[PDB]
Amino acid sequence: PNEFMQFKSKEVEKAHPIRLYTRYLDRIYMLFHFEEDEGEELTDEYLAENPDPNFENSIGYNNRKCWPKDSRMRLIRQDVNLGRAVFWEIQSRVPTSLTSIKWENAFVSVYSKNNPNLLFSMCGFEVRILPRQRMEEVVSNDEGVWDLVDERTKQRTAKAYLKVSEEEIKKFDSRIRGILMASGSTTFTKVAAKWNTSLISLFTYFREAIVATEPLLDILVKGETRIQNRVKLGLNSKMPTRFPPAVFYTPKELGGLGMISASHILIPASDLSWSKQTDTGITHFRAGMTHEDEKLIPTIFRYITTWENEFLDSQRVWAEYATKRQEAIQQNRRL
């Protein structure tokens, strides 16, 4: 049997439009690669079975509303008709009495000559893949980008950009809201430990995908302010001079709460008329949680190794382990 997305040959790989498939719990992920012939044939089958001369296929097309307007799939009528032909062919292949594959829950993204971005959202990661040939200027980018090395020629050939999906951001907001709400009469250290548990569970899952995500940083700053005000409204006084940052982030052995900081960063701010159009550079910084002191509180993201920097290292150390194991079998010694 093959490993995951591996093939026995190139000829079996190109023999069919459905190149890659994977299924999560209930989310399928189908990567297709059409020629010029088969795509327009499927598109004309769709347009003969669902005609629309009014060109309202862009109306109701689910498109990734988190990315900027040049970043997500542009509503090019050829590619929108191709994508709806694709989802129509996939919707035809399963009866509704088995599962309700509707257009509403479906995100279709068509990399073509007009849409240089291949979008998806797997496991909470909004990923936008963009090649090195489809960028005008190759710019070294943030920690939240992934260098996609081609396993043929050993060269970084695409940049996958990460964001945290809006569903998972709302789930984290609801989790911090549950931390506030279950803390009716709860000790301050247990509120701090709940904040540390949910914060570590946020930043050790979505590790580098939080740099390029604005609403998650906004809800982090708001939520850590909620946790500090949960501590301070247990004391019926929320004055900033009365409560330094040294009373929260001081660890639990020294007597403080041992809260972990993720909101003394500067939030990247940019032009919110332009930021919903293009990939704006980080041109301004809004202050996250200013205290009157100049306490540079260290943040947890600097002490967590990001995923690309874990996975390249994982391939390195498992190559080293498989080589040491092959040698220890050749040396006939137990490793």
């Binding site: 920690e143 060269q155 540079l296 600097r302 690309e308 874990e310």
Partner: protein, 198 residues
């Protein structure tokens, strides 16, 4: 110089992106008499971590693109690191440092004239230094391909690691070194050595 080093380090740790740490370093308005030491704190704090992260690269690229003095500071600290401090470091520390300077060379914020100081022979190469050159060209290959890296190496001269005039033995040593790395950038030295042997 402990509390200023602490201040630079906590600037580098109370940030989120490399852009933000670059902003927090540049807001400190540090004169020229400490910029090399700040770049050394950035180096020696990149090497603390287990693996190399892109944060320090993004940081250093914004620092270089801000002002000419930071670019001269990174020139001087790359020369300082290779000519002095590779004897200190573990192989892990050299993984981080080699991919750091490879990500800075591959996006041409450091010149190829900054790799001009490396002359690799039997007597001038540390073994740690050879592993560092391996990590540099590993990051350079994985960033730039073989073709664009050939074109960048043929933009200016590197007489040390590419002895075009050279000797009949140092060419063979550089050939065996760059094939122990596994580059495939070898055929010019091959033609030169086949000229020299006859």
């Amino acid at each position: 110089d402990v509390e200023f080093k602490k201040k630079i380090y906590l600037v580098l740790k109370s940030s989120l992106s490399g852009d933000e740490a670059a902003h927090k370093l540049l807001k400190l308005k540090i004169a020229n008499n400490l910029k090399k030491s700040v770049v050394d704190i950035i180096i020696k704090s990149s090497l603390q971590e287990s693996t190399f992260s892109k944060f320090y690269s993004i940081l250093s690229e914004r620092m270089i693109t801000f002002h000419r003095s930071w670019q001269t500071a990174y020139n001087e600290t790359f020369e300082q690191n290779y000519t002095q401090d590779i004897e200190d470091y573990e192989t892990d520390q050299l993984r981080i440092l080699g991919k750091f300077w490879g990500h800075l060379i591959s996006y041409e914020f450091l010149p190829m004239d900054c790799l001009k100081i490396i002359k690799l022979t039997e007597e001038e190469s540390c073994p740690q230094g050879r592993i560092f050159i391996k990590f540099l060209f590993q990051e350079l290959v994985n960033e730039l391909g073989l073709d664009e890296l050939q074109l960048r190496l043929n933009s200016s001269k590197l007489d040390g690691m590419f002895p075009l005039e050279g000797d009949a033995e140092h060419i063979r040593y550089s050939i065996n070194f760059f094939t122990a790395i596994g580059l495939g950038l070898t055929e010019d030295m091959r033609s030169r050595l086949t000229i020299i042997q006859e």
